[PDB]
Amino acid sequence: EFRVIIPARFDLPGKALVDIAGKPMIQHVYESAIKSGAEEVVIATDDKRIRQVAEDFGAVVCMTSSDHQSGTERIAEAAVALGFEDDEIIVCLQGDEPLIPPDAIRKLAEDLDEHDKVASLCTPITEVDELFNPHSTKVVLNRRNYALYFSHAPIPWGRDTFSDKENLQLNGSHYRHVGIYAYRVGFLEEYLSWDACPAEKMEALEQLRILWHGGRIHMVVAKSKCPPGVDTEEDLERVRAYF
Amino acid sequence: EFRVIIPARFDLPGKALVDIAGKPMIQHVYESAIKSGAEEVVIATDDKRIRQVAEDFGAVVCMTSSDHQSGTERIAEAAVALGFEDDEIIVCLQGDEPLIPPDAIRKLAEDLDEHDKVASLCTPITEVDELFNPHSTKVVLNRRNYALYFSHAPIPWGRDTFSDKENLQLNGSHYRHVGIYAYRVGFLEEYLSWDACPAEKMEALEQLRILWHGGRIHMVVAKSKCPPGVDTEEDLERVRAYF
Numbered sequence: 498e499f500r501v502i503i504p505a506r507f508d509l510p511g512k513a514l515v516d517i518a519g520k521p522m523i524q525h526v527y528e529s530a531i532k533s534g535a536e537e538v539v540i541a542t543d544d545k546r547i548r549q550v551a552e553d554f555g556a557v558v559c560m561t562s563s564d565h566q567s568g569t570e571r572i573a574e575a576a577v578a579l580g581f582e583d584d585e586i587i588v589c590l591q592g593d594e595p596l597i598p599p600d601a602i603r604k605l606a607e608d609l610d611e612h613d614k615v616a617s618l619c620t621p622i623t624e625v626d627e628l629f630n631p632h633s634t635k636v637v638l639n640r641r642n643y644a645l646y647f648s649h650a651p652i653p654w655g656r657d658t659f660s661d662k663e664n665l666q667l668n669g670s671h672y673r674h675v676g677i678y679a680y681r682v683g684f685l686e687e688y689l690s691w692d693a694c695p696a697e698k699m700e701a702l703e704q705l706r707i708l709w710h711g712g713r714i715h716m717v718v719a720k721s722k723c724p725p726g727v728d729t730e731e732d733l734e735r736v737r738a739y740f
Numbered sequence: 741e742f743r744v745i746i747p748a749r750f751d752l753p754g755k756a757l758v759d760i761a762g763k764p765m766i767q768h769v770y771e772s773a774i775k776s777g778a779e780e781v782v783i784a785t786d787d788k789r790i791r792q793v794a795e796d797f798g799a800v801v802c803m804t805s806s807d808h809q810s811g812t813e814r815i816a817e818a819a820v821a822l823g824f825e826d827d828e829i830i831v832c833l834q835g836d837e838p839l840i841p842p843d844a845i846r847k848l849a850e851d852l853d854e855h856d857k858v859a860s861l862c863t864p865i866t867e868v869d870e871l872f873n874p875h876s877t878k879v880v881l882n883r884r885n886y887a888l889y890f891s892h893a894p895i896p897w898g899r900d901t902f903s904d905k906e907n908l909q910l911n912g913s914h915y916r917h918v919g920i921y922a923y924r925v926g927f928l929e930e931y932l933s934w935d936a937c938p939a940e941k942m943e944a945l946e947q948l949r950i951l952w953h954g955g956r957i958h959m960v961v962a963k964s965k966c967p968p969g970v971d972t973e974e975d976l977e978r979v980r981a982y983f
């Protein structure tokens with residue numbers, strides 16, 4: 498009823514295989530996908546070392562092309578190689594997100610199925626330090642929970658409050674974006690025809706491409722804690738300290 | 741073919757009437773509206789001192805209600821009091837913008853007329869200091885120049901460049917929002933039925949309400965220099981120094 502594809506990268510050098518409490522990161526990610534109730538979970542990678550490690554814990558791996566460098570290109574190649582029909586729901590779960598609640602993965606799939614193109618997940622920001630951290634991605638929502646914008650900048654900005662952080666309390670006000678999407682397979686062909694935009698390149702946020710091209714992304718707010726993922730060595734030590 | 745309404749506020753105390761090179765600010769604004777080729781230019785205010793000064797330089801003034809406190813409430817009351825038909829194009833020119841090129845005012849009206857709800861104007865940011873100044877409003881555009889978001893935050897954020905401002909060059913990358921809109925009168929009734937949203941209150945940007953409610957705002961990029969307007973005493977001294 499839905500399938501998970503996990504794009505996993507090697508060049509944090511050796512990222513997908515960094516040890517987290519005994520298991521490589523990609524294994525943690527894979528386990529979250531299984532527990533979600535996905536019909537099938539597949540790891541998509543262009544790296545043979547990642548293939549080896551994932552096959553050795555029993556994962557199905559789709560080897561993708563060194564040409565297809567973005568996560569979504571990988572997903573697309575894998576989705577073609579695996580034979581997914583245009584009506585099938587794919588969850589793209591980034592290999593840098595090892596701590597997404599499995600129920601949230603499923604909820605994301607349900608959201609996209611409930612409504613007749615792309616859904617993604619976010620979580621409340623309650624700590625001022627996280628809001629203002631340029632490493633975190635913020636997302637601003639409209640009334641119906643569609644994304645208006647995604648940024649590293651602290652948005653929405655408190656015109657009269659951000660200059661007084663000691664009195665600043667965050668109360669339903671701000672959301673952090675999680676690296677997971679739900680897409681129908683059909684959408685990936687249209688998506689891949691679109692070129693990049695300046696904002697996506699500045700922010701290094703590929704999802705801005707969808708907004709640039711007049712597309713919409715529906716957001717689901719995770720009920721449960723969704724710890725931030727792992728892109729830096731600081732992130733890795735934080736996540737290792739959860740166990 | 742289009743009409744300008746200028747909402748003008750008194751409580752910068754005494755804002756609309758601050759002296760700029762011999763004439764109150766509101767007079768400068770009014771003159772830009774006349775030069776635009778507007779069929780009619782009307783000042784909307786709930787303040788009798790503003791009425792007096794504007795009538796004494798020959799302006800038509802619509803006295804609005806002390807209850808109707810937002811600029812758009814003023815515009816709406818004035819638009820009703822003046823008898824504007826639902827198909828008529830209103831340009832809302834804020835009383836804090838004395839240096840908008842008259843050709844840009846007209847271009848904004850044309851934009852809205854060319855396309856079958858709300859248009860607004862922006863101008864390129866070429867100075868890093870302006871981008872990063874929380875007083876300035878930034879706007880992010882989609883491919884067809886619709887606004888995705890408006891903020892005081894520096895957006896789009898340069899993930900890998902904002903930590904190296906000495907090498908940062910702004911090249912078609914960033915836009916500053918100007919306090920001017922074009923609306924058909926018809927839209928104002930729908931607009932006024934909408935309630936505020938958290939983001940509009942944090943940012944103090946009323947235009948976020950339109951985005952919140954799933955509305956769109958088409959942006960025109962001014963060809964000519966559009967100096968920032970006047971909301972603070974710093975702004976006033978800068979603008980006085982242009983003359």
Ligand code: NI
Nearest residue numbers: 663664665666
């Ligand atoms: Ni507070």
Ligand code: NI
Nearest residue numbers: 906907908909
């Ligand atoms: Ni540079």
